[PDB]
Amino acid sequence: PFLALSSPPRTGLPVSPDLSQPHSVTLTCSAASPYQWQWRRNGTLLNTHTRFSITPSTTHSSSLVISGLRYSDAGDYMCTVEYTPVTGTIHLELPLIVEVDSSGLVVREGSEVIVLTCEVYGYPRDSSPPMWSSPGRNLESGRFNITPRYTGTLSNGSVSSSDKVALSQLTIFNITVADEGEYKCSVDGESASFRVDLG
């Protein structure tokens, strides 16, 4: 009887865990019909892990659960079924997403200010500190204040989209039309922007 896989679908597209619950991911491979399963990461056999747990079904399907997900866990995870063996490949990629949020116009001691917060979620890498930039604009001027937000090491874990971590804050003082434009925060090789517009 020919052995085939009904899941996961045959694809080379990247696969990412849902960032609302990014601490764990379950990868399941199932046979088309009613087995022994082997799991590999880049062709290397995965018991000894304690964050990679493999559980068979009550044998037509096998599931690999990765707990304590961190950015370094990204790789090609393959499930091989046998009674020619059939192998399915999951290209598990772990994104880092930057988000720049604005407080809007805020009055501080009679002066209007705007506070932009650089937030991240997903799987931080701790490879590049947050950096603020703005085209045609010197952010080292007196009208701007940059306040880093010192957080714990995030590269060993994950950050849920429901609980975003603020990394830095840029405050613009005495808002005028000349302050309009894009403000970008770049973290860990990723970036996000917010456009200040008084219109």
Ligand SMILES: *[C@@H]1O[C@H](CO[C@@H]2O[C@@H](C)[C@@H](O)[C@@H](O)[C@@H]2O)[C@@H](O[C@@H]2O[C@H](CO)[C@@H](O[C@@H]3O[C@H](CO[C@H]4O[C@H](CO)[C@@H](O)[C@H](O)[C@@H]4O)[C@@H](O)[C@H](O[C@H]4O[C@H](CO)[C@@H](O)[C@H](O)[C@@H]4O)[C@@H]3O)[C@H](O)[C@H]2NC(C)=O)[C@H](O)[C@H]1NC(C)=O
């Ligand atoms: C096992 O093999 C894995 C695959 O290896 C690749 O394929 C083989 C055939 C070889 O050619 C090998 O050289 C290839 O790398 C391998 O996993 C791969 O690791 C690389 C490097 O870590 C990953 O590249 C990075 O991926 C992340 C994640 O992308 C997602 O998130 C971003 C947003 O954050 C989205 O935009 C994407 O669409 C994805 O949703 C990227 O963020 C990252 O980009 C940043 O870094 C690069 C390089 O520094 C910069 O140029 C960019 O501008 C960004 O700053 C990289 O693209 C690759 O995704 C990953 N492939 C997988 C998991 O399939 C793994 O390392 C090998 N070893 C082990 C032990 O697993």
Ligand SMILES: *[C@@H]1O[C@H](CO)[C@@H](O)[C@H](O)[C@H]1NC(C)=O
């Ligand atoms: C904003 O305007 C107030 C009032 O004129 C002034 O006291 C304050 O120093 C100004 N802020 C900056 C950053 O120049």
